[PDB]
Amino acid sequence: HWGYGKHNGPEHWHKDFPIAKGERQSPVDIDTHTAKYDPSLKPLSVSYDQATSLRILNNGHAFNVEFDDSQDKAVLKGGPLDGTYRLIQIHMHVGSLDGQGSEHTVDKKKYAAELHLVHWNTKYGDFGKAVQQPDGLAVLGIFLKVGSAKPGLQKVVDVLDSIKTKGKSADFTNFDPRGLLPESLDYWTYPGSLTTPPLLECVTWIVLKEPISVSSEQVLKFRKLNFNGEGEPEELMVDNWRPAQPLKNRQIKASFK
Template identity: 55%
Template sequence: MKGNHWGYGQENGPDVWHKNYPVALGSRQSPIDIPRQVSHDPSLGPIVLDYDHCTSINISNNGHSVVVYFDDTDDRSVIHGGPLENPYRLKQFHFHWGGKGCDGSEHTVAGNSYASELHLVHWNAVKYKSFDHAAAAPDGLAVVGIFLETGDDHRWLHTITDAMYMVKYKGSVTDFKGFNPKCLLPSSLHYWTYLGSLTTPPLHESVTWILLKDPIAVSEKQLGKFRLLQFTGEEEDQRSRMENNFRPPQPLKGRRIRSSN
């Protein structure tokens, strides 16, 4: 597993990431299992997602997930409030999911997983000059996690799944303008929060996690479009379907999980 050749298979998956990324065994790794009982922290206010000016740019397949990127050169799409001291700018969102008939969320709740998990990734532009600087700093990133549970078609998710055929292979990218992720939020923004890490290499311990308690719906048909994506490039001989692209829960190691309600 040299360089950037990490993945989700037996030989390059989460069990061996620590060989190239020793922080994988660190003290604030993500994801985690959220216990059934988490005490309410009255100091936590509501989380506010100001996504009124949509700045999505493109959608891509980075060989690990499908990613929608945003113009993060100003504060037109930010989150603030909750556990955050500053506003954080939206950089991208991506998904994790399982194989057919299998759950694929990264975080679990009382040991139970969901069909998929959406991550909205933001960075602290007040303190840091770039996303890369922020990604390596203890308070650099804030990620909002949203669970997807199998049910009815999600009325807005089709905008993303309908574009997936254009980014089927690793390294492909296409324009994806005018998408506002506000439509992917559940009606309630109650959340759990804890200090953690990126769930993919380089696994920087830089993330304030904000996990929304209420899931959104996704249909099996929509999940099927995620599984048509490929971990591999179009020119590669061996095709590898993109599924089970999640890291299992990591030890809590004494960290405190707080609840907004």
């Protein structure tokens, strides 16, 4: 399998998934002095009104919240997107200390953590089918910076002990993902990939300019999950982020001045 350690980490990924060395790999560093402001990028349309969360899982690589995507109940539209994209999974990437944790970086600065609200293009029928298309996913990347407690993350924080080890999951209905959003919907966008195996180059990345805040106590608690299964030596799930990949001839655009 794979992970973030020295023996199964980001450097080994290409052996099982040769696309790891692709031309459109994620995450990437967002260079503020080169990213291009595009006046024709429409505003993001987040419609999470009837969102239906299902469960939270510790998959052994990160924890994730899975949603019911049987219909258009929690969708992303607008921005650089054509059509409708359904929310299926929310993943969190976190560091071992405040100075690192995010996968995307801004002028080389790593945020304490990064959330990935993974949505898939409805013209493809489903997620599995969508990851095979260059425009099958729209992933909203949201940075976390230490500050005031975020009500939305607190919902996840309260459940962390139920999913301490790999394979453990818990009911996670009535979770409103709007609570994970910053004030501003301004963003950066570029074509990229999944940041975890299979690393399929299928995503239109939408990385929000404004990080959401997380208290010290909340991040402390997010670093208490384990990569390992119950009964195996404790390996804290920290620094589960893939580093920035080669931008190639790709253009990162900004929806803001």
